[PDB]
Design an enzyme around this catalytic site. Structure first.
Site, PDB file in Angstrom:
ATOM      1  N   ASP A 114      13.494 -10.718  18.538  1.00  0.00           N
ATOM      2  CA  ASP A 114      12.110 -11.679  18.688  1.00  0.00           C
ATOM      3  C   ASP A 114      12.131 -13.149  17.916  1.00  0.00           C
ATOM      4  OD1 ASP A 114       9.537 -12.052  17.850  1.00  0.00           O
ATOM      5  OD2 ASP A 114       9.486 -11.280  15.810  1.00  0.00           O
ATOM      6  N   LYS A 162       0.732  -0.986   0.072  1.00  0.00           N
ATOM      7  CA  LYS A 162      -0.038   0.036  -0.244  1.00  0.00           C
ATOM      8  C   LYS A 162       0.985   1.575   0.081  1.00  0.00           C
ATOM      9  N   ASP A 174      -2.646  -4.303  15.075  1.00  0.00           N
ATOM     10  CA  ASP A 174      -2.530  -5.699  13.989  1.00  0.00           C
ATOM     11  C   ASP A 174      -2.603  -7.236  14.740  1.00  0.00           C
ATOM     12  OD1 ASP A 174      -1.495  -7.131  11.569  1.00  0.00           O
ATOM     13  OD2 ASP A 174       0.406  -6.181  11.677  1.00  0.00           O
ATOM     14  N   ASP A 175      -1.648  -7.122  15.586  1.00  0.00           N
ATOM     15  CA  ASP A 175      -2.638  -8.193  16.645  1.00  0.00           C
ATOM     16  C   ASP A 175      -3.649  -8.357  17.320  1.00  0.00           C
ATOM     17  OD1 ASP A 175       0.941  -8.043  16.707  1.00  0.00           O
ATOM     18  OD2 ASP A 175       1.051  -7.886  18.369  1.00  0.00           O
ATOM     19  N   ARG A 227       3.229 -14.107   1.204  1.00  0.00           N
ATOM     20  CA  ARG A 227       3.508 -12.011   1.447  1.00  0.00           C
ATOM     21  C   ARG A 227       2.342 -11.878   0.078  1.00  0.00           C
ATOM     22  NH1 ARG A 227       5.201  -9.244   4.950  1.00  0.00           N
ATOM     23  NH2 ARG A 227       6.426 -10.773   5.748  1.00  0.00           N
ATOM     24  N   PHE A 243       0.247   1.134  16.877  1.00  0.00           N
ATOM     25  CA  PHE A 243      -0.430   0.420  15.510  1.00  0.00           C
ATOM     26  C   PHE A 243      -0.079  -1.460  15.292  1.00  0.00           C
ATOM     27  CE2 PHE A 243       1.874  -1.966  12.037  1.00  0.00           C
ATOM     28  CZ  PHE A 243       1.220  -1.508  10.567  1.00  0.00           C
ATOM     29  N   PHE A 268      13.746  -5.035   2.178  1.00  0.00           N
ATOM     30  CA  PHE A 268      14.520  -5.650   2.542  1.00  0.00           C
ATOM     31  C   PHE A 268      14.716  -6.433   3.564  1.00  0.00           C
ATOM     32  CE2 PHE A 268      18.033  -4.346   5.818  1.00  0.00           C
ATOM     33  CZ  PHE A 268      18.717  -5.173   5.809  1.00  0.00           C
ATOM     34  N   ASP A 280      13.367 -11.878   6.147  1.00  0.00           N
ATOM     35  CA  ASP A 280      12.519 -11.969   7.707  1.00  0.00           C
ATOM     36  C   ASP A 280      11.806 -13.251   7.426  1.00  0.00           C
ATOM     37  OD1 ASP A 280      12.778 -10.161   9.244  1.00  0.00           O
ATOM     38  OD2 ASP A 280      11.126  -8.991   9.017  1.00  0.00           O
ATOM     39  N   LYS A 291      11.797  -3.743  16.196  1.00  0.00           N
ATOM     40  CA  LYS A 291      11.177  -4.168  15.360  1.00  0.00           C
ATOM     41  C   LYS A 291      10.636  -3.423  14.094  1.00  0.00           C
ATOM     42  CE  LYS A 291       9.461  -8.452  13.891  1.00  0.00           C
ATOM     43  NZ  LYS A 291      10.266  -8.802  12.879  1.00  0.00           N
ATOM     44  N   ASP A 306      11.619 -17.265   8.690  1.00  0.00           N
ATOM     45  CA  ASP A 306      10.342 -17.480   8.889  1.00  0.00           C
ATOM     46  C   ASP A 306       9.891 -18.320   8.530  1.00  0.00           C
ATOM     47  OD1 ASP A 306       9.726 -15.011  10.792  1.00  0.00           O
ATOM     48  OD2 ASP A 306       8.547 -14.251   9.400  1.00  0.00           O
TER      49      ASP A 306
HETATM   50  C1  YF7 Z   1       3.198   4.422   8.882  1.00  0.00           C
HETATM   51  C2  YF7 Z   1       2.487   3.640   8.313  1.00  0.00           C
HETATM   52  C3  YF7 Z   1       2.198   2.306   8.608  1.00  0.00           C
HETATM   53  C4  YF7 Z   1       1.721   1.940   7.994  1.00  0.00           C
HETATM   54  C5  YF7 Z   1      -0.330   1.931   7.669  1.00  0.00           C
HETATM   55  C6  YF7 Z   1      -0.953   1.038   7.560  1.00  0.00           C
HETATM   56  C7  YF7 Z   1      -1.179   0.288   7.253  1.00  0.00           C
HETATM   57  C8  YF7 Z   1      -2.312  -0.621   6.321  1.00  0.00           C
HETATM   58  C9  YF7 Z   1      -2.754  -2.507   6.360  1.00  0.00           C
HETATM   59  N1  YF7 Z   1      -0.976  -2.527   6.161  1.00  0.00           N
HETATM   60  C10 YF7 Z   1      -1.817  -3.848   5.772  1.00  0.00           C
HETATM   61  C11 YF7 Z   1      -1.463  -5.011   6.593  1.00  0.00           C
HETATM   62  C12 YF7 Z   1      -2.449  -5.507   7.922  1.00  0.00           C
HETATM   63  C13 YF7 Z   1      -3.245  -5.506   7.974  1.00  0.00           C
HETATM   64  C14 YF7 Z   1      -4.667  -5.345   8.555  1.00  0.00           C
HETATM   65  C15 YF7 Z   1      -4.177  -4.130   9.319  1.00  0.00           C
HETATM   66  C16 YF7 Z   1      -3.194  -4.085   9.937  1.00  0.00           C
HETATM   67  F1  YF7 Z   1      -2.467  -2.870  10.883  1.00  0.00           F
HETATM   68  C17 YF7 Z   1      -2.274  -4.057   9.550  1.00  0.00           C
HETATM   69  P1  YF7 Z   1       0.308  -4.352   4.058  1.00  0.00           P
HETATM   70  O1  YF7 Z   1       1.415  -4.028   4.626  1.00  0.00           O
HETATM   71  O2  YF7 Z   1      -0.690  -6.115   3.457  1.00  0.00           O
HETATM   72  O3  YF7 Z   1      -0.314  -3.212   3.148  1.00  0.00           O
HETATM   73  N2  YF7 Z   1      -3.686  -2.441   5.641  1.00  0.00           N
HETATM   74  C18 YF7 Z   1      -4.502  -1.525   6.703  1.00  0.00           C
HETATM   75  N3  YF7 Z   1      -4.179  -0.424   7.097  1.00  0.00           N
HETATM   76  C19 YF7 Z   1      -2.968   0.163   7.214  1.00  0.00           C
HETATM   77  S1  YF7 Z   1      -2.798   1.801   7.610  1.00  0.00           S
HETATM   78  C20 YF7 Z   1       0.063   3.508   7.949  1.00  0.00           C
HETATM   79  C21 YF7 Z   1       0.892   4.448   8.227  1.00  0.00           C
HETATM   80 CL1  YF7 Z   1       0.116   6.224   8.269  1.00  0.00          CL
END
Ligand code: YF7
Ligand code: YF7
Ligand code: YF7
Ligand code: YF7
Ligand code: CL
Ligand code: CL
Ligand code: CL
Ligand code: CL
Lengths: 341, 341
Positions: free
Chosen positions: A167, A50, A234-235, A105, A230, A91, A96, A191, A100
């Site tokens: 980790d 993204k 995610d967890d 991915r 964040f 990288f 990783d 990390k 793992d």
């Molecule tokens: C600095 C920074 C770093 C990461 C993100 C975000 C990542 C992200 C996101 N990332 C996915 C992984 C993921 C999927 C669901 C929830 C989550 F927190 C992260 P992927 O790495 O596959 O694009 N998915 C949905 N919303 C967001 S918002 C947003 C900001 Cl401002």
């Protein structure tokens, strides 16, 4: 979304990044074949996410520099440094995924699992890292913030590798006495948080002439706390997230991860519950995963999370109030908006 | 030997290197366990070679700087930058041993084959690289050559990784049409010669205030040619070297290597000889190795080598005559002495 706006120009620049990195094939015929492989490595591993981290460099740069000083060249440099963050990330991930034993991915076959790559992916990962410094030199060597950015990327690399080591020591072999709150927070900070949240804003700051140690330290205090929240979310989402909304389906429990969830569960469980956890955590079999999840629910960890999300939101807003100045609060609020949504 | 003289002080400094790299355990309790693992990685992988590359930094520095400007601090810095070269090397080898599936190195079990390390060695390798930049900052950040040394180590890393990519593409799958003289020389230049011969002298030069592009380019021309000869001799000795003199026993043929020997053999062989090579090269079975060796002997490759050694020696001496100035010729002759012996 200010991110939706810059996004097109950002992804478009990638073509140029690749062209300039591969233009040595014009000075050095001999290495043509290697440069062809570098191009393949860049296109497969740097594209397809993204770009939130890279884009953050460009958005922050636009908010921090007077419009009078944002010429076509200034913006070339911002797009390049944004892409340097995405290459740093590529990288980390390629390496990783090897460590793992991951299969996929970003909904694709991991690079190292591709026919004919295998452990050659280790050198490919190293080249992705090296590309960062090639680009900083090609685009930024005459700039006053050159050495500041080199040191920031090198420090971001060290912090992340330290975090990885921690980790790897914590989650090798199935054990939960390792899975403490202090250790969890340490892993997340080193990390994930330094490179995901501090690095891209910091980079923008140096590019804008904001190099003071106090300003960097103030921004860091907000940004490492945002990085902590964040990862915790995610967890949480890994297990309780709709997978068609999140785009993953969770394997934290199967994989013996030091997840926020299991840390909270271990603070809360009885000796009997500890056993149900110990007997089931980190197994492939699905009935074992249902019974971890069920225990998390028995202990109302979703409620605990929502509570933590609210608290975390007050605290971040207080931090922005107190430490943003003299940056525009919007630098921090745009980030907070992307992740507390 | 000027190398035998500085050697004690050089190996003694290692203790201090480790201490300073691990002193963050005093600022950051949380990462204690990771820093303990870093210390283990440094002691197992950075110690045990002959330190020729690192020592070259110190010897050259002593020949290039007026004795008036070689204070205790100057020399701390030279020992540190010498150790940075050895850490760069340890990064390469740990990663290479993983990629090649090697068992031993320097007469020891490869780090990644150690019980409980495995592919975690990838992150360990990355930390070894990172340590370089930690040390340059801690010891050299106030020096006028700081940014020069950062860029030199980063460029040395890129050149070496490019060389590795070329090597991996050339010697994956058994094939000899890949094994050409132009390709061999390219691999050697990028993968070995830049970091082994150019990097340590270059580092000494910057430390002495010799930063001119022409002086660096002159030194490079001598040093890449020395690096070429050094690898060719290494390839020759692998098969025809006394192993109790060299300290290795050769597996170049077993391992399908793009060795100087097989390159020469392919320039010289008949279609019938090509077949004997094709049928036997890169097999474990020892009768197949005896028959490659025998073919090399039928074609007098030892004679070809000695001829090449003599020619190469005239040519290097001519290069020193023509390109050393204004460095003292002894900078180059000390190296030439270590490798044409
Ligand atoms: C600095 C920074 C770093 C990461 C993100 C975000 C990542 C992200 C996101 N990332 C996915 C992984 C993921 C999927 C669901 C929830 C989550 F927190 C992260 P992927 O790495 O596959 O694009 N998915 C949905 N919303 C967001 S918002 C947003 C900001 Cl401002
Ligand atoms: C800077 C910033 C940060 C967060 C938000 C909002 C988050 C949010 C929100 N967040 C939910 C999370 C949440 C749910 C309940 C309480 C709480 F504090 C946070 P979700 O990510 O589930 O959509 N839910 C409903 N409205 C809003 S408005 C809005 C702004 Cl402008
Ligand atoms: C810059 C530089 C780089 C390497 C060397 C040398 C390495 C070396 C050496 N190296 C061993 C490997 C080896 C073993 C036999 C022949 C050979 F050329 C290289 P190891 O890496 O195990 O210490 N052995 C015997 N003599 C020498 S001289 C000398 C210099 Cl001046
Ligand atoms: C700077 C420098 C470089 C090389 C030498 C010497 C190399 C050498 C020498 N080299 C042999 C290699 C060799 C053997 C025959 C001809 C030739 F040109 C080179 P090896 O490595 O087998 O001891 N053999 C006998 N005496 C000497 S004197 C001496 C100095 Cl001072
Ligand atoms: Cl400009
Ligand atoms: Cl920090
Ligand atoms: Cl001093
Ligand atoms: Cl070059």
């Amino acid at each position: 979304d200010v991110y939706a706006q810059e996004k097109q120009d950002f992804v478009q620049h990638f073509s140029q990044i690749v062209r300039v990195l591969t233009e040595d094939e014009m000075g050095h015929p001999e290495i043509g074949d290697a440069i062809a492989r570098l191009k393949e490595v860049l296109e497969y591993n740097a594209i397809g996410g993204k770009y939130n981290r890279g884009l953050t460099v460009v958005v922050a740069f636009r908010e921090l520099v007077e419009p009078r000083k944002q010429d076509a060249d200034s913006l070339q440099r911002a797009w390049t440094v944004g892409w340097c963050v995405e290459l740093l990330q590529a990288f980390f991930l390629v390496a990783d995924d090897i460590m793992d034993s991951s299969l996929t991915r970003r909904g694709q076959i991991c690079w190292y699992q591709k026919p004919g790559v295998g452990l050659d992916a280790i050198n490919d990962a190293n080249l992705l890292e090296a590309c960062i410094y090639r680009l900083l030199k090609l685009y930024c060597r005459e700039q006053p913030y050159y050495l500041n950015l080199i040191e920031l990327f090198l420090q971001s690399s060290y912090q992340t590798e330290i975090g990885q080591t921690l980790d790897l020591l914590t989650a090798p072999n199935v054990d939960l006495v390792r899975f403490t709150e202090k250790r969890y927070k340490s892993i997340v900070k080193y990390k994930t948080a330094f490179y995901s949240f501090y690095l891209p804003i910091a980079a923008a700051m140096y590019m804008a002439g904001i190099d003071g140690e106090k300003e960097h330290a103030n921004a860091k205090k907000i940004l490492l706390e945002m990085g902590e929240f964040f990862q915790i979310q995610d967890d949480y989402l890994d297990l309780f997230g709709d997978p068609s909304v999140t785009g993953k389906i969770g394997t934290d429990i199967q994989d013996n991860k030091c997840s926020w969830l299991v840390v909270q569960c271990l603070q809360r469980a009885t000796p009997e519950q500890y056993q149900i956890l110990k007997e089931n955590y980190g197994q492939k079999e699905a009935e074992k995963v249902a019974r971890v999840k069920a225990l998390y629910e028995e202990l109302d960890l979703p409620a605990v999370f929502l509570q933590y999300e609210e608290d975390s939101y007050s605290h971040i807003m207080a931090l922005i109030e107190q430490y943003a100045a003299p940056l525009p609060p919007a630098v921090f609020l745009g980030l907070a908006r992307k992740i507390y949504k």
